[PDB]
């Protein structure tokens, strides 16, 4: 049973065997390649950083977004550790140029951040801040306990469960309001009326039926 | 015309010291992080936060 249109087959069987979209590149949770491309060029354009020097800054940004959250209300400066000192890059271009949201941009960094948590847990106990806020008592699921994890089909079901529990604990029935006050503040019409030296009051031309009786 | 330059100037002054512009002190904005947006002549661009709008 294959779909018909005017007696003609709607589908191409031959292309259907040779189609391997690898399940991640056609997701909605991950932003499109052109949008991440425009984001990566626009944040480089606003930092004045050469193309050689930019991936370092992305390595720093990924880690910072592991620790803190990739909410769209992110403001201020984000910190990268150069040796012992801190550098403070502005957050403005990052949330400014992220076109769908910052989550779908940062979901490109998902498995690399996932392996970075494991690389940091090789040396020392490294649980990301977001897992410390969500109060995940496990510790071995700290590899999955960050803000922008993109749930692939090749993840454990216990990791699915942990991520969905952290997401549902995090949202707490957020009523997504659509509008806030609008900029058309003027609710009263113009006082187009002409003032005159002949006028009696500013708000009154000339008493006309007053009988003084 | 001076909108985004003033916007970045508030951030540059908040790097050093707590610098909230007077207009935000008159409007009694309790936030402090939105002092970057709390001036009289801000030109609301599409690339601004919705909380700043």
């Amino acid at each position: 049973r294959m779909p018909k249109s005017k007696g003609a087959t709607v589908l191409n069987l031959e292309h259907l065997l040779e189609y391997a979209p690898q399940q991640i590149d056609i997701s909605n949770t991950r932003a499109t390649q052109s949008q991440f491309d425009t984001w990566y060029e626009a944040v480089q354009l606003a930092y004045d950083i050469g193309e050689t020097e930019m991936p370092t800054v992305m390595n720093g940004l990924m880690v910072w977004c592991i620790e803190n959250g990739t909410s769209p209300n992110i403001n201020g400066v984000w910190v990268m550790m150069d040796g012992d000192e801190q550098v403070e890059y502005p957050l403005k271009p990052i949330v400014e140029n992220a076109k769908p949201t910052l989550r779908q941009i940062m979901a490109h960094f998902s498995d690399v951040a996932e392996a970075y948590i494991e690389m940091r847990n090789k040396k020392e106990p490294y649980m990301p801040r977001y897992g410390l806020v969500r109060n995940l008592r496990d510790g071995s699921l700290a590899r999955y306990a960050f803000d922008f994890y993109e749930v692939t089909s090749r993840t454990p079901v216990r990791a699915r469960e942990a991520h969905i529990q952290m997401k549902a604990a995090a949202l707490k029935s957020a009523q997504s309001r659509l509008f806030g006050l609008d900029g058309g503040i003027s609710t009263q019409e113009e006082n187009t009326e002409r003032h005159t030296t002949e006028d009696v009051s500013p708000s009154m031309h000339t008493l006309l039926g007053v009988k003084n009786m | 015309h001076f909108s985004d330059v003033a916007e970045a100037y508030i951030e540059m002054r908040n790097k050093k010291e707590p610098y909230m512009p007077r207009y935000g002190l008159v409007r009694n904005l309790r936030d402090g992080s939105l002092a970057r947006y709390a001036f009289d002549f801000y030109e609301v661009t599409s690339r601004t936060p919705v909380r700043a709008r």
Binding site: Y47, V57, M80, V87, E88 | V5, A8, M12
Partner: peptide, 11 residues
């Protein structure tokens, strides 16, 4: 790791 300016150019 480059230091950054606040009112840097190309804006």
């Amino acid at each position: 790791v480059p230091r950054i300016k606040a009112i840097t150019s190309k804006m």
